[PDB]
């Protein structure tokens, strides 16, 4: 099974440094080329730099608007493809992808996020929304609000509640941070019997958060 | 460069319909480095790439079978024969044989169904929160596609103007609906200032728009 797992992705502030790694498996890594690929919501996709095989005396090649600032090197040895990316700006932004080339088609990493910012980490306060008093079934959540960089992920009942639970993606505020909403729909013969909890986790802050939703 | 124009840029068709998407090479370059050998991709939200169709025409290991790509000279098309319901995602050319690579616009696709009348719900500003110094309320949308949405905030009957944010999930890979969740952000003074919060949803599901409330103070 080819796999390609990327690290190494995070927050930096604007001017600094990272080198994101990617472990190959699978394959016989000597022999095929490798490439990053990057993603931003508003520009879509863009190739990034590309590395051929020893034989061709590891000749690399850049997309115009990183030379001189990203550096791609292979590590036979380890099987690993690394991304030395310096002096960071804006438009580097995005999920990174780690590409290899077996000419006929190429296969694609999970990819790593890479966010350039000014902002340091912020850790997320997490409120409740409780339940009303549409008949049958109602509806509660957890609002994640105020927090810095993406992303959070978030549970219940430590993943034991999975069906008709809607996590809503994150929304810049006013403010430059991001809020989240998470909610679930259950019956309401059970809100003063079941326990619901949503564990919230935001692992570029460390706030592993569990707060159970009683109704008012 | 090596640009390539994507069309459409977005779509619906109901489970079990054609869909052709086309991928239209630069021809500044079908003379420079011959024409080209385009590959196919789609991606879901938050995943990686899956490869479907590689040198134009070749179906990748594994790729179901409705999945075709054609293409002569420089008109490349990518075929579904039936959509299915796990077919919502973004399609995209590829070319990866002369640099710089390039990639097309995309498209977006989205499944069809009947139309799905929202449920309401509508969510007090947390205690623990207000103790911070600021209050906004939720108010929730669940299941539904037609995701042209509309929902307004009143405070006693005052239309707000922009003091709230939706967020809309992807479409649900269940029964093709969709939800949202507008936010209204507000001091906690103004919150104790009013008493009234509601969010009128209008909604093509929908006869009569349907108003959710609920007054501060149980």
């Known amino acids: 099974e080819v796999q390609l797992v990327e690290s190494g992705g995070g927050l930096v502030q604007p001017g600094g440094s990272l080198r994101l790694s990617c472990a190959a498996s699978g394959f016989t890594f000597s022999n095929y080329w490798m490439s990053w690929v990057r993603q931003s919501p508003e520009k879509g996709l863009e190739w990034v730099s590309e590395i051929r095989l020893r034989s061709d005396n590891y000749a690399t090649h850049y997309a115009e608007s990183v030379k001189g600032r990203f550096t791609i090197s292979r590590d036979n040895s380890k099987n690993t493809l690394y991304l030395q990316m310096n002096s960071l700006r804006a438009e580097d932004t995005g999920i990174y992808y780690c590409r290899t080339y077996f000419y006929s088609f190429s296969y694609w990493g999970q990819g790593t996020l890479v966010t350039v910012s000014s902002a340091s980490t912020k850790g997320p306060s997490v409120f409740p929304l409780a339940p009303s008093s549409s008949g049958g079934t109602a509806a509660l959540g957890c609002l994640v609000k105020d927090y810095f960089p993406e992303p959070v992920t978030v549970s219940w009942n430590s993943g034991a509640l999975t069906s008709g639970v809607h996590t809503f993606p994150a929304v810049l505020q006013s403010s430059g941070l991001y809020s989240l909403s998470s909610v679930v729909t259950v019956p309401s013969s059970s809100l003063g019997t079941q326990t619901y909890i949503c564990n919230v986790n935001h692992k570029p802050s460390n706030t592993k958060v569990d707060k159970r939703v009683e109704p008012k | 460069e090596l640009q390539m124009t994507q069309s459409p840029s977005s779509l619906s068709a109901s489970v079990g319909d054609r869909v052709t998407i086309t991928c239209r090479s630069s021809?500044?370059?079908?003379?420079?480095?011959?024409?080209?050998?385009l590959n196919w991709y789609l991606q879901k939200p938050g995943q990686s790439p899956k490869l479907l169709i590689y040198?134009?025409?070749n179906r990748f290991s594994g790729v179901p079978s409705r999945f075709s790509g054609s293409g002569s000279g420089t008109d490349f098309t990518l075929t579904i024969s039936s959509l299915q319901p796990e077919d919502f995602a973004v399609y995209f050319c590829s070319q990866g044989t002369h640099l710089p690579y390039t990639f097309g616009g995309g498209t977006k696709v989205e499944i069809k169904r009947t139309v799905a009348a929202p449920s309401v719900f509508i969510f007090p500003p947390s205690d623990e929160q207000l103790k911070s110094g600021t209050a906004s309320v939720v108010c929730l949308l669940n299941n539904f596609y037609p995701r042209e949405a509309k929902v307004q905030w009143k405070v006693d009957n005052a239309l707000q103007s922009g003091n709230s944010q939706e967020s809309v999930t992807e479409q649900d890979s269940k029964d093709s609906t969709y939800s949202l969740s507008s936010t209204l952000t507000l001091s906690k003074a103004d919150y104790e200032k009013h008493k009234v919060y509601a969010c009128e949803v209008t909604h093509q599901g929908l006869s009569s728009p349907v108003t959710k409330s609920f007054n501060r103070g149980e």
């Open positions: 021809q500044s370059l079908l003379h420079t480095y011959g024409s080209p050998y």
């Open positions: 040198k134009v025409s």
